[PDB]
């Protein structure tokens, strides 16, 4: 097998971990298990402390010009490792030796996943969102020499069995009837979304435009603020339905990050340092942070002045469970 390793700036402290992504099912989150190595005894009595932290960070342009930023620490755990073992920990200890000491953390359920909001050109500092960290420091204050920081990411993956077909309809009297459906409720990243629309128009006035859009809603729970709405991808069609006539069509629309780079505040999957990451995956409600959800809106601009008839369909957008760990880089 292959494990990840990091060393202290002074070099006397080393940390070993087995993974970088920790799946969160309805059951317990995958436990964090690792090893700490103090090769020399420069630590006369000062011991090595291991902390697992979760951080929520938010800031918006208006709040920036006023000067208001929101920072919070949801989860903090500390362990005195230096003072049951899984197979990986025992193999690591056997390979390393006497200095190796194991540490373990258990992430409780109902905690936010790693999410980052797309920074603009002006900000060149830490990104906003929810992130996790594992910090090991030689303290019996935290010194940059002794301490080491490793960024981990709690993630979720698409459920094995999909749900019912998302379908919705409306009627409006002045009547006119609209209905629409989606092929499935779970869509993978980069896969086109196919929507079926059907309209019955019997009023004298006709319809002139049909707009289909994919909207992302990021609910920032803590430090109450309005949610983030964004038209990730839009398709506008010039179609007319005569009175006493019906009209049925199938449209295909695909979200991606190439055209949405200029948008600020767009929710994205957790980044380790700076790597390109796709659009964020819908959170399974089954918390205390950015909750990402996706919907598709179909709108008919009826008549002249005039109004529109709209239908919203919710669908889940995630990744299938992978056999191998994500590289968390650019593969080529």
């Amino acid at each position, epitope marked *: 097998t*292959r494990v990840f390793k990091k060393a202290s700036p002074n070099g006397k402290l080393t940390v070993y971990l087995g993974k970088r992504d920790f799946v969160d099912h309805i059951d317990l989150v995958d436990p964090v298990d690792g090893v700490v190595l103090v090769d020399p005894e420069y630590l006369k009595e000062r011991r090595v402390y291991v902390t697992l932290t979760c951080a929520f960070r938010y800031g918006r342009e208006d709040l920036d010009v006023l000067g208001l930023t929101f920072r919070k620490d949801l989860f903090v755990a500390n362990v005195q490792s230096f003072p049951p073992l899984t197979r990986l920990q025992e193999r690591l200890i056997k390979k390393l030796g006497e200095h190796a000491y194991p540490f373990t953390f258990e992430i409780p359920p109902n905690l936010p996943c790693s999410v980052t909001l797309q920074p603009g050109p002006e900000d060149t500092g830490k990104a906003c969102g929810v992130d996790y960290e594992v910090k090991a420091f030689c303290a019996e204050k935290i010194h940059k020499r002794n301490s080491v920081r490793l960024v981990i990411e709690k993630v979720q993956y698409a459920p094995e069995r999909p749900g019912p077909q998302p379908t919705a309809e409306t009627t409006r009297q002045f009547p006119l009837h609209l209905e629409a459906s989606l092929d499935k409720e779970i869509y*993978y*990243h*980069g*896969e*086109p979304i196919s929507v079926n629309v059907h309209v019955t128009n019997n009023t004298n006035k006709t319809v002139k435009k049909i707009k289909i859009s994919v909207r992302q809603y990021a609910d920032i729970c803590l430090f109450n603020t309005a949610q983030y709405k964004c038209p990730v991808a839009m398709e506008e069609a010039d179609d007319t339905v005569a009175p006493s006539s019906t009209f049925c069509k199938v449209y295909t629309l*695909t979200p*991606f*990050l*190439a*055209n949405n780079r200029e948008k600020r505040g767009l929710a994205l999957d957790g980044k380790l340092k700076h790597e*390109d990451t*796709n659009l964020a995956s819908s959170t399974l409600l089954r918390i205390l942070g950015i909750i990402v959800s996706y919907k598709v809106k179909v709108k008919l601009v009826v008549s002249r002045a005039s109004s529109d008839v709209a239908v919203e369909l919710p669908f889940t957008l995630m*990744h299938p469970k*992978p*056999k*191998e760990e*994500p*590289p968390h880089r650019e*593969v*080529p």
Partner: single-chain antibody
Amino acid sequence: GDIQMTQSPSSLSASVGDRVTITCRASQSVSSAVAWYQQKPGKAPKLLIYSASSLYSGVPSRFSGSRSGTDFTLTISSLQPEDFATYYCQQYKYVPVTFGCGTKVEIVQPGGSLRLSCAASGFNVYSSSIHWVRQAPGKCLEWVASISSYYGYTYYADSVKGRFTISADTSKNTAYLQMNSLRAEDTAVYYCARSRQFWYSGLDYWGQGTLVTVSS
């Protein structure tokens, strides 16, 4: 620069029923991002092993891969007459894929311009990356260009800069190479390939290469 992926055995006697080993050496550390390919004579390469240990689906459970340092090993425990082809070594950690020299297991003026088209079915340009490679007579595989539309980035090799521009029609699900200036080294067979997005497990699917005879 281009990590030189040297394949030591040029040819092997490889009597049937025997255990055969092929080794690959990299100039720098490419981690475990190494893939193995098999090419029958006059056909497209076929992926065998990715990540240097994982067997691709549909591969008989005889090929094995291993990595100690920068040395990568492909071992076939049982050889059969069906298994007689050329074996290539690739790394996919950096921008140039830098294929390796083959190991054989045996018992139009420059102003001229031409374009090639890829007929891809059941694929999406946003969930896949499209690659263009070429093979000259008696030479290892050469990488020409790559495109990824989800992030919207294209790469070209040093020699094909300015004279090569690849594109993709998303509606027709088609890829184009669009040669403009044809220099001396453009006489080859051109292969069109597809790779996964957000994850690289080798050039899984290959297209029927086209034979081009240009440059006088």
